[PDB]
RNA sequence: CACAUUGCGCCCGCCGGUAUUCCGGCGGGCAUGCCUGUUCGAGCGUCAUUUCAACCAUCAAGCCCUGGGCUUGUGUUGGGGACCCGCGGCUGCUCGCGGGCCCUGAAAAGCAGUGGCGGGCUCGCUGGCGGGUGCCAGCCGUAAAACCC
């Protein structure tokens, strides 16, 4: 699912710092001697959140390793409340390469071109079937609790130290 | 582990190969080459993983089994038909004199008793060949370039050319020489 | 509008999410030095409304100060000594 | 037999979902000066 | 540092600037020239032209060897092509000046001795076969030597051509070199006992004769009319073996 | 000994028996496999049934490849409970479903010569069919001779 | 102030001196030890040497039987009737 | 660096003494915290990496009544609807091939049927001969051939 998402997302990568200058130079040279609206991947936490609140984002991808987790902890609930399909992608750096940055906390797609409208729609169904149904019950549950053999020995030892007397 | 996409990718690849082979068969001699007896160099390149049985035999006869393999072939009616079949897996074109000279000298090898023996002296040139009048390596170059009566004997003697991946470098005409220059 | 969501979250400091994050982060700061540079604000909304910008020249240093009193009470605040 | 079948099924499941790509003392390394 | 920036760009999917950074790298596989400029190193190592002439012996032995060797990763194909060009350009200078003096046939190859401004230069050229590379042979060590020698010979060639009066570099015909002209693809233009041995003579070289050694020897010692079979390459005075005006024909056949 | 039955559907074009056998034999062992097809044309109906000899393998493989998006097709891996597994389900299993050119066979059978004696009494049956059509043309008000 | 745009095809299409120009003799430093020249070839090395230099059939088989880096010289003189029969030297690159 | 003694370290260069090695002198530099950037790194901190691409004829060949027209270049997801037909079998009902109308996301829950040729496997008889096969990512259409070698 990550590969299929990034296949569509790569076709809508924003222009680099070098490419934008060349396009600006091309138009400047032409005038010295009328275009369709650009379609691109939206990035920026404040930008994407406003798109979700205004119900403009068709698909939202959220990183799983934001260092202050409180920056994105509300995003899945907000996406669910608005009816926006969402998925969690392993890697803020992987999202960064998509937008030619070191790190992207969240990326979004608002509108794609006509040749990719059907591709985006299929990926929307794939995510909500392949990901959202799989976490419909586990998103309400507490995580953790992966005690290994060493942890289990400590817990059993702790109980037997309080079986006889409990100093308080 | 082999993924489900690769299974579907290979089938659709085989389906198209079965298509073009059928068309090539029905309109045999599809390539519109004038009737000429000249020289073409053929290089085996990366392509479809599962080769269909008919192209598989053709690559075997031409000794183009490994990648980066090169051979000299005369453009007869059978050879042009054969090369058309193996078009997806080969890069081919007409060599030039410098290309032939560089290949037979720098990377020249010969088959003696089924063994890969380098062309280090003319003694083995006139021992294997020579009954056809080829006593030096230059005679071998002459017979390959100005293709003559004993091109077949000269060709089978020449072990397939094991070239090297270029370092930053259909009928390709003389542009096969640019590929040879980089790949040599 | 992520910072408005952060403002409300920081109001609920005893909530399960914030209590959990504050518990783990307290242990981590304790393993570090008393005064050390923080590469990034842990409360970006709070830092932003106090005048922090993401320019070259703005730094965050976090510090822990022993709490309590000297029965005498210091007229300045524990935040002032930090 | 049953354990071998279960191990093979689990190994294929892990590859399908996650792919196939997965003296003693410490000194400050010498760096360029 | 540049290689690190190329690797980061390549590993991030932005091939446009990775190609842009590659152009700054000056890689030998694309340019065919040495990666680092060694003009000041050569100047301090050879403070005068005389010192450069005294150590041309090892320089020419390397370059003529690598002009016959296959292309490796340390020394790519375009690097070897420049070795042919420099060696061919050098051979033209001796032909015009008649600076070639001696030549010797040995079981190890062919020895050429020349005299430039009073220094004897001796170098060995391998026989034109499939040279063998076996055992532990390191082309990175030899690549470093090739890099130094090509820069040295290129500057030596420029000064020698300027002293005569010819322009440098000589005009090179890619089409003729494609046809197999080898030494015959160079045109030498100006700027605006030796030459009598084979002067009024005419030779035809058969197929089994070594074209490159014979042509160098004859053309340096006076000959102006040399022909060979068309398989040997473009540039022969005549190709028909039945040409009446052929005094000598060199053969090596039973 | 509890064989398991898998129901796979929404298959992409090309995910046929050999690929279904090859991919799922990596998960475990395959006993029988059938891809449903048409008699009129040799084309798959984008669903298939796979029987594993080990029940646990069928459970693991169905969970992993259930909602798998393959060439634009989101797959469907559902385990058929052993109750409603039809006794006659793997009948063309392990057999190649070759395409028969029924149009060529039926059409050329109209070409092969034969004594038209029964054809002429069929011509009389054609006449009586024409008479029935003539009744259908009475409300039309159409007259046509022979 | 700035250059106008040009198409990438045109950019690709668009894109020597005397080292000893100011040269004077300098005194040779005594710390330099120049490597000696390899000795010039002798009469043993020619492809058609005088018969005296040729060895005996026994003196040959002992030579190839002896392992390298134990021989007085890295070659034995050999006589060839023609340049055509002179083989490539196997230790040229080495 | 050292209560600072005009003493002693380390790096780069120079000068004078028989000097490539020795001596002495001279010049330029070597404190801590912190910031911005550079380059060199560390981490059983986290992630990606067995590539779902394009690739038929963007025109060719042959013709005719000489300039327009003609012929050949076989290339289609599946399923459903008391709808209207043509043609073949079926005693008949009905079933097949092909149409016209309508619906559906690249949608889906047994309903497997038409005779062979060559190859593989397997079984019998004397390498050969004679039978079977829900095996052929090999062909054909009911014989058979081709492929194959």
Swiss-Prot record, chain G:
Recorded coiled-coil stretches: none
Biased composition (Basic and acidic residues): 55-70
Top-level taxonomic group: Eukaryota
Record localization: Nucleus, Nucleolus; Nucleus, Nucleoplasm
Family per similarity comment: Belongs to the WD repeat BOP1/ERB1 family.
Subunit text: Component of the NOP7 complex, composed of ERB1, NOP7 and YTM1. The complex is held together by ERB1, which interacts with NOP7 via its N-terminal domain and with YTM1 via a high-affinity interaction between the seven-bladed beta-propeller domains of the 2 proteins. The NOP7 complex associates with the 66S pre-ribosome.
Biological function: Component of the NOP7 complex, which is required for maturation of the 25S and 5.8S ribosomal RNAs and formation of the 60S ribosome.
Protein's recorded name: Ribosome biogenesis protein ERB1
Organism for this UniProt entry: Chaetomium thermophilum (strain DSM 1495 / CBS 144.50 / IMI 039719) (Thermochaetoides thermophila)
Gene encoding the protein: ERB1
Span within the parent record: 302 to 401 of 801
């Amino acid at each position: 699912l990550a590969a299929q998402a990034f296949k569509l997302l790569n076709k809508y990568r924003p222009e680099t710092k070098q490419e934008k200058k060349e396009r600006l130079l091309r138009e400047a040279t032409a005038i010295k001697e009328v275009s369709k609206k650009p379609y691109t991947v939206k990035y920026g936490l404040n930008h994407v959140v406003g798109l979700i609140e205004n119900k403009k984002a068709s698909l939202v991808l959220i990183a799983n390793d934001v260092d202050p987790i409180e920056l994105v902890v509300f995003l899945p609930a907000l996406c669910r409340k608005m009816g926006i399909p969402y998925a969690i992608i392993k890697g803020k750096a992987r999202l960064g390469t998509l937008v030619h940055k070191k790190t992207a906390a969240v990326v979004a797609i608002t509108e794609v071109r006509s040749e990719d409208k059907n591709e985006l729609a299929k990926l929307i169904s794939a995510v909500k079937e392949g990901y959202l149904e799989k976490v419909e019950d586990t998103r309400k549950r507490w995580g953790g609790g992966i005690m290994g053999f060493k942890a289990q020995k400590r817990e059993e030892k702790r109980k037997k130290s309080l079986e006889t007397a409990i100093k308080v | 582990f082999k993924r489900a996409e690769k299974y579907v990718k290979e089938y659709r690849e085989q389906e198209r190969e079965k298509i073009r082979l059928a068309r090539i068969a029905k309109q045999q001699g599809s390539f519109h080459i004038p009737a000429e007896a000249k020289l073409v160099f053929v290089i085996r390149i990366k392509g479809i993983n599962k080769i269909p049985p008919k192209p598989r035999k053709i690559l075997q006869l031409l000794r183009l089994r490994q990648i980066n393999n090169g051979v000299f072939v005369k453009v007869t009616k059978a050879t042009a038909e054969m090369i058309k079949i193996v078009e997806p897996w080969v890069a081919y074109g007409y060599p030039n004199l410098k290309s032939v000279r560089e290949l037979i000298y720098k990377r020249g090898y010969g088959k003696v008793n089924g063994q890969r023996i380098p062309l280090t002296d003319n003694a083995i040139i006139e021992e294997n060949l020579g009954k056809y009048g080829i006593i030096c390596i230059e005679d071998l170059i002459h017979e390959i370039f100005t293709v003559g009566p004993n091109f077949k004997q000269a060709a089978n003697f020449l072990w397939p050319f094991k070239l090297s991946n270029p370092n930053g470098g259909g009928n390709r005409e003389e542009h096969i020489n640019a590929l040879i220059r980089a790949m040599n | 509008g992520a910072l408005k969501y952060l403002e409300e979250l920081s109001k609920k400091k005893q909530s399960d999410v914030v209590r959990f994050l504050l518990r783990v982060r307290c242990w981590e700061y304790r393993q570090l030095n008393v005064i050390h540079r923080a590469s990034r604000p842990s409360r970006p909304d709070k830092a932003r409304r106090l005048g922090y910008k993401a320019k070259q020249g703005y730094v965050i240093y976090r510090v822990r100060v022993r709490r309590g009193g000297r029965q005498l009470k210091y007229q300045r605040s524990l935040r002032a000594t930090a | 037999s049953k354990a071998a079948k279960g191990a093979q099924a689990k190994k294929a499941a892990q590859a399908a979902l996650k792919g196939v790509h997965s003296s003693t003392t410490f000194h400050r390394p010498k760096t360029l000066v | 540092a540049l290689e690190k920036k190329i690797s980061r760009a390549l590993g991030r999917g932005d091939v446009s600037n990775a190609a842009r950074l590659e152009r700054n790298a000056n890689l030998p596989e694309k340019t065919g020239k040495p990666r680092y400029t060694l003009n000041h190193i050569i100047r301090e190592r050879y403070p005068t032209f005389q010192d450069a002439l005294r150590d041309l012996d090892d320089c020419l032995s390397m370059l003529f060897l690598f002009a016959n060797l296959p292309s490796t990763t340390a020394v790519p194909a375009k690097m070897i092509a420049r070795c042919e060009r420099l060696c061919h350009e050098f051979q033209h200078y001796l032909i015009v000046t008649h600076s070639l003096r001696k030549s010797f046939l040995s079981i190890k190859g062919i020895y050429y001795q020349a005299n430039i401004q009073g220094e004897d230069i001796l170098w060995l050229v391998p026989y034109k076969f499939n040279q063998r590379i076996v055992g532990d042979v390191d082309f990175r060590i030899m690549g470093t030597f090739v890099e130094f020698y090509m820069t040295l010979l290129g500057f030596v060639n420029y000064r020698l051509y300027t002293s005569i009066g010819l322009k440098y570099p000589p005009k090179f015909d890619q089409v003729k070199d494609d046809q197999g002209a080898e030494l015959a693809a160079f045109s030498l233009e100006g700027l605006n006992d030796p030459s009598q041995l084979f002067a009024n003579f005419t030779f035809f070289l058969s197929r089994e004769t070594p074209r490159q050694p014979l042509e160098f020897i004859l053309r340096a010692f006076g000959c102006k009319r040399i022909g060979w079979d068309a398989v040997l390459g473009e540039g022969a005075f005549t190709t028909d073996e039945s040409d009446p005006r052929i005094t000598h024909q060199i053969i090596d056949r039973p | 000994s509890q064989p398991g039955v898998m129901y796979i559907a929404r298959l992409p074009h090309g995910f046929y028996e050999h690929e279904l056998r090859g991919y799922f034999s990596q998960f475990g062992e395959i006993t029988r496999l059938r891809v449903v097809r048409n008699k009129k044309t040799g084309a798959s109906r984008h669903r298939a049934f796979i029987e594993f000899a080990d029940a646990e393998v069928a459970d693991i493989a169905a969970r992993t490849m259930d909602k798998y998006l393959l060439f634009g097709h989101i797959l469907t891996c559902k385990i058929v409970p052993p109750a409603q597994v039809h006794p006659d389900l793997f009948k063309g299993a392990n057999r190649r479903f070759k395409v028969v050119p029924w149009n060529k066979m039926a059409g050329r059978q109209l070409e092969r010569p034969l004594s038209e004696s029964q054809w002429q009494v069929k011509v009389a049956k054609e006449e009586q069919r024409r008479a029935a059509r003539a009744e259908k043309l009475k409300e039309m008000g159409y007259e046509f001779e022979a | 102030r700035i250059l106008p745009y040009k198409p990438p095809e045109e950019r690709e299409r668009e894109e020597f001196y005397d080292l000893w120009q100011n040269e004077e003799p300098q005194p040779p430093n005594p710390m330099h030890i120049p490597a000696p020249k390899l000795p010039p070839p002798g009469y043993d090395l020619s492809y058609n040497p005088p018969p005296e230099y040729l060895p005996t059939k026994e003196e040959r088989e002992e030579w190839e039987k002896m392992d390298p880096e134990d021989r007085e010289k890295d070659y034995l003189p050999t006589k060839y009737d023609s340049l055509r029969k002179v083989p490539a030297w196997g230790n040229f690159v080495k």
